[PDB]
């Protein structure tokens, strides 16, 4: 039986927020990772939006909304203390140059070599990569936050969907598990009270090893 979607989003999001530290520059993608914004609590996280902001603020109170100030999903935002707006070449020197400390994205597939597929389903959904290749190529820590299954196995041995980048994914975070991607391959690092290694085994196609 499938879990309540809001509860899976909540456990994934809260676990991603544990990976940051005060001063991290963080880029969150549209969808699941935008909720990580609520559990960052009092960390000194600086949110960066690819359309040209460093120091994204929370949404504005209804009536103070600015269509000249949106985020990467075109939703109204404010500007935190110390923010800077910029053109998108500068935006993507931040992203491609290794100044984003952690980008959190979701994924259709992800494999044990670290490859990531998340921008296209051939013939069904073709939205374009947007800033996603640049983000995963350039970020220091690539965190994939996703539903462990979609209905269908997502953590494979080798991705079959059109790739987003090769060898980018550092962390995989599902409702079931925390995988770490290393040179050896996938390493199970955490299990959530919503699953057991017996369950992870038959919902994960990639071989993997276990820590202590």
């Amino acid at each position: 039986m499938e879990m309540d979607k809001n509860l899976v989003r909540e456990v994934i999001a809260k676990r991603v927020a544990q990976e940051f530290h005060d001063g991290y520059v963080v880029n969150l993608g549209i969808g699941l990772p935008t909720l990580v914004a609520n559990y960052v609590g009092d960390m000194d996280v600086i949110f960066q939006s690819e359309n040209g902001c460093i120091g994204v603020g929370p949404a504005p109170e209804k009536g103070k909304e600015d269509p000249y100030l949106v985020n990467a999903g075109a939703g109204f935002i404010t500007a935190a203390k110390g923010a800077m707006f910029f053109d998108s070449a500068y935006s993507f020197g931040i992203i491609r140059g290794g100044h984003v400390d952690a980008t959190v994205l979701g994924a259709l597939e992800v494999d044990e070599k670290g490859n990531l597929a998340n921008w296209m389903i051939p013939g069904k959904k073709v939205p374009g990569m947007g800033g996603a290749m640049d983000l995963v190529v350039g970020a220091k820590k690539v965190i994939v936050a996703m539903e462990h299954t979609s209905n269908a196995i997502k953590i494979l041995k080798e991705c079959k969907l059109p790739l987003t980048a090769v060898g980018v994914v550092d962390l995989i975070i599902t409702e079931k598990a925390v995988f770490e991607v290393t040179d050896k391959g996938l390493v199970l690092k955490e299990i959530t009270p919503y699953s057991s290694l017996e369950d992870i085994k038959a919902t994960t196609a990639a071989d993997f090893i276990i820590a202590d």
Binding site: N51, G52, S88, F92, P127, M129, G138, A165, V166
Partner: protein, 216 residues
């Protein structure tokens, strides 16, 4: 002074088959009045270089629906189902460009570079048909400059000489594509006096702007 002109005279430089830079991130920063004027004029067969194709009823997407666009070079086409439709049928051509790469390729034509090397795209389909240059045992993609015939850009404040300010997140590709087209039209939300704007607070210099229009 000489530069502020009629919309009717501005769009007189957008002609069929021309490659056009249009600013805007999901229409935030799109010159919407220019977009409307081009819909009356009926300019056919364009190639649009933009971050996205907006919505089917906002921004660049209005041109895609009005059958005015032969080809798109963009990073994102998802918020417009009409782009997706024409892509899969063949009635429109679409080059999907990683967004950082597109900033760099537009910038390159503006800044006189013959290309840039990015690691973004290695291993994916964007690599298809592209020189892979190796720099000290790491491979990169040669991405080529994109000059346009015209650029249509948006400023929240343009002074009489052409100096442009784009506030908050409205500098999307605007300062870049203003440098990367033969003719550059800025749609101004407001037109302040020549010199009114401070040399530190500018986003596009007068020397790139050919024509100013006030947003209708």
């Amino acid at each position: 002074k000489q530069k502020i002109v009629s919309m009717e005279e501005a769009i007189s430089h957008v002609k069929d088959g021309m490659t056009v830079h249009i600013g805007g991130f999901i229409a935030c920063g799109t010159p919407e009045s220019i977009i409307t004027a081009l819909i009356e004029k009926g300019v056919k067969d364009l190639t649009i270089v933009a971050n996205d194709t907006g919505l089917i009823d906002k921004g660049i997407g209005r041109l895609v629906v009005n059958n005015q666009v032969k080809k798109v070079i963009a990073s994102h086409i998802g918020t417009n189902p009409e782009t997706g439709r024409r892509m899969q049928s063949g009635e429109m051509e679409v080059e999907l460009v990683p967004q950082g790469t597109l900033a760099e390729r537009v910038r390159a034509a503006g800044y006189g570079l013959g290309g840039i090397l990015t690691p973004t795209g290695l291993g994916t389909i964007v690599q298809e048909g592209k020189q892979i240059i190796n720099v000290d045992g790491k491979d990169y993609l040669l991405e080529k400059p994109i000059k346009a015939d015209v650029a249509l850009i948006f400023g929240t404040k343009v002074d009489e000489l052409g100096n442009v300010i784009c506030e908050k997140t409205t500098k999307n590709f605007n300062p870049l594509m203003a440098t990367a087209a033969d003719v550059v039209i800025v749609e101004a939300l407001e037109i302040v006096p020549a010199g009114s704007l401070s040399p530190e607070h500018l986003d596009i210099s007068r020397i790139f702007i050919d024509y100013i229009v006030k947003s209708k």
